């Protein structure tokens, strides 16, 4: 099943402040008005990188696994959000093909009402997390509006992620190499965007 990305899935491309200015950038971005997969779970390809977004109010989605097998043979990022904590570990975990709840080990780390939105990519041995939270007036699909996702985690994990799964509505889109024009406002925030490939006006 499917819905549409509309204006969403932009994220701050680099650790740089620019203000009251228009800037051109090329990266893995979620293409505008692209179709996105829809879910309420299966195991999915990572592709070049993921856009993930879920309507939330109670942490029904517990987190994710990222890796290749997600089982025993090679290292995988277990990622969990558990009340006051966010927790990450890198083992070749011996868990089930899809771990669930009701109502090698080289690294570890510790850190509807809303839409929670995220972007994940894995480049040059570094894994990136970008995110945003927003209050909402729609929960049936991603609302046509704009809010750039901002980085949380940036780690030289060295693993070759190719596959992932949710831990437990939500939507999955995929990044593609594109050129974007970004509107940085006077306060250094991204406030609007154009994808040059969307249509001839956008070019």
């Amino acid at each position: 099943a499917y819905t549409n990305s509309f204006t969403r899935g932009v994220y701050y491309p680099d650790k740089v402040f620019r203000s009251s200015v228009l800037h051109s950038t090329q990266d893995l971005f979620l293409p505008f008005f692209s179709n996105v997969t829809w879910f309420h779970n299966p195991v999915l390809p990572f592709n070049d990188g993921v856009y993930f977004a879920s309507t939330e109010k109670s942490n029904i989605i517990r987190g994710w696994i990222f890796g290749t097998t997600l089982d025993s043979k090679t290292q995988s990022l277990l990622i969990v959000n558990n009340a006051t904590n966010v927790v990450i570990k890198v083992c070749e975990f011996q868990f089930c093909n899809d771990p669930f709840l009701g109502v090698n080990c080289t690294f570890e780390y510790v850190s509807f009402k809303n839409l929670r939105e995220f972007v994940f990519k894995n480049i040059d041995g570094y894994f990136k997390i970008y995110s945003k939270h927003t209050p909402i007036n729609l929960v049936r699909d991603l609302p046509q509006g704009f809010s750039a996702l901002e980085p949380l985690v940036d780690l030289p994990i060295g693993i070759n992620i190719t596959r992932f799964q949710t831990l437990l509505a939500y939507y999955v889109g995929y990044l593609q190499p594109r050129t974007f024009l970004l509107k940085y406002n006077e306060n250094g925030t991204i406030t609007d965007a154009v994808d040059c490939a969307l249509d001839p006006l956008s070019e």
């Binding site: 650790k15 740089v16 402040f17 901002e150 980085p151 030289p156 060295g158 250094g188």
Partner: protein, 426 residues
């Protein structure tokens, strides 16, 4: 100026001669408050150690190796390296590393180092002979021994398990005496970078988080988002930074610079000169802050005259009254209230026939360059290479031939306007 113009005589004018550039007073370095240093106490001061015949290991990566201090500290009596300089341990790094370790009687305990001596090194105690990184060793009599030679100490793959107990004892002789060693075999492990105080308002060379530049640093009102470290101008240039130790934002500005320009009368008149430092504030460099920059060696004057030597922004200079260089706001001309009214007219009662010269250039010097003879000094070996560049010589010689023919045409169009050679009466 004489050297800039390659001449011993200089005519009246303004000449640019050099660029002034405020020098970096010092180098700043900033990196975050240091953290996650490597647990070398857990390597060298460990509560237990494996035999040299059975060397253990532990992680030495994603943590900062302050190893230059550890090598001079009480944790080791000796040290060595298999693929690095021993002085590099202040700042050396690897993407991953581990501390292999063991203890024994000193002849076998010396095997606890990369490619070390005795067959027990390659059979068990050592890192591989080709392995990168370094090792350290010390006397083990504080724990790694027993009165008859400790049976937990022993000798004979690298960092692995045909073997027997060691002589390691508090009463042992120089070869049997208890010793322990570890090999920190080979970005994540990196030795700690230093930092300076953050000196503002001076021109400074700087590093922040591995970007570098030279500029003036000042407190700023710019509101970076927390993950942003660097600010940019419209065209790529860094305009601000976060200090990694104090999370406020500072501007950057280039250290002040501009054309040194020499105001001079002719040297066929005087050797007195005045210097305009274009654009700069006089604080950076008989002195006069023009709107064009700091002027030095010229007298500011309240009169005004025709502009003799131009400076800029309405300022000009000249050598005048016993005499010196003056600088003044130029006069646009004498002012005149015209005697207008609804019924007054002025009519001329007499005339002057004026004659005024006007001068126009009509031709350049007709010039041609044989591009092959210019590029190659008769060398056939050079000419054969010039052919690889294709049509360029033919094209350049054609373009100069077009210019050369046009000079005859310019001369024709100016002077050949009369069809007959008229001659006067006598």
């Amino acid at each position: 100026t004489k050297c800039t113009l390659k001449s011993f005589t200089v005519e009246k004018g303004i000449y640019q001669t050099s660029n002034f550039r405020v020098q970096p007073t010092e180098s700043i370095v900033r990196f975050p408050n240091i953290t996650n240093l490597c647990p070398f106490g857990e390597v060298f001061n460990a509560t237990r150690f494996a035999s040299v015949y059975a060397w253990n290991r532990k992680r030495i990566s994603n943590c900062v190796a302050d190893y230059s201090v550890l090598y001079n500290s009480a944790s080791f009596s000796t040290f060595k390296c298999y693929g690095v300089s021993p002085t590099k341990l202040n700042d050396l790094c690897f993407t991953n590393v581990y501390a292999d370790s063991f203890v024994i009687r000193g002849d076998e305990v010396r095997q606890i180092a990369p490619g070390q001596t005795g067959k027990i090194a390659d059979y068990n105690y050592k890192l591989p002979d080709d392995f990168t990184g370094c090792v350290i060793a010390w006397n083990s009599n504080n724990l790694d021994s027993k009165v008859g030679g400790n049976y937990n100490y022993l000798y004979r793959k690298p960092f692995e398990r045909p073997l027997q107990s060691y002589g390691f004892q508090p009463t042992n002789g120089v070869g049997y005496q208890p010793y322990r060693v570890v090999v920190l075999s080979f970005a994540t492990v990196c030795g700690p970078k230093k930092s300076t105080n953050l000196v503002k308002n001076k021109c400074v060379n700087f590093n922040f988080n591995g970007l570098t530049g030279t500029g003036v640093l000042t407190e700023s009102n710019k509101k970076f988002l927390p993950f942003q470290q660097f600010g940019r101008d419209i065209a790529d240039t860094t305009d601000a930074v976060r200090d990694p130790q104090t999370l406020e934002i500072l501007d950057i500005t280039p250290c002040s610079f501009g054309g040194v320009s020499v105001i001079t009368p002719g040297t066929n008149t005087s050797n007195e000169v005045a210097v305009l430092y274009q654009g700069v504030n006089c604080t950076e460099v008989n002195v006069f802050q023009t709107r064009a920059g700091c002027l030095i060696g010229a007298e500011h004057v309240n009169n005004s005259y025709e502009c003799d030597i131009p400076i800029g922004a309405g300022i000009c200079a000249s050598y005048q009254t016993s005499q010196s260089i003056i600088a003044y706001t130029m006069s646009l001309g004498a002012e005149n209230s015209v005697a207008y009214s609804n019924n007054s007219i002025a009519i001329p009662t007499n005339f002057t026939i004026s004659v005024t010269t006007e001068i126009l250039p009509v031709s350049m010097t007709k010039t041609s360059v044989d591009c092959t003879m210019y590029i190659c000094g008769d060398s056939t070996e050079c000419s054969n290479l010039l052919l690889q560049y294709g049509s360029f010589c033919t094209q350049l010689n054609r373009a100069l031939t077009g210019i050369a023919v046009e000079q005859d045409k310019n001369t024709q169009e100016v002077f050949a306007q009369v069809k007959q050679i008229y001659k006067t009466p006598p």
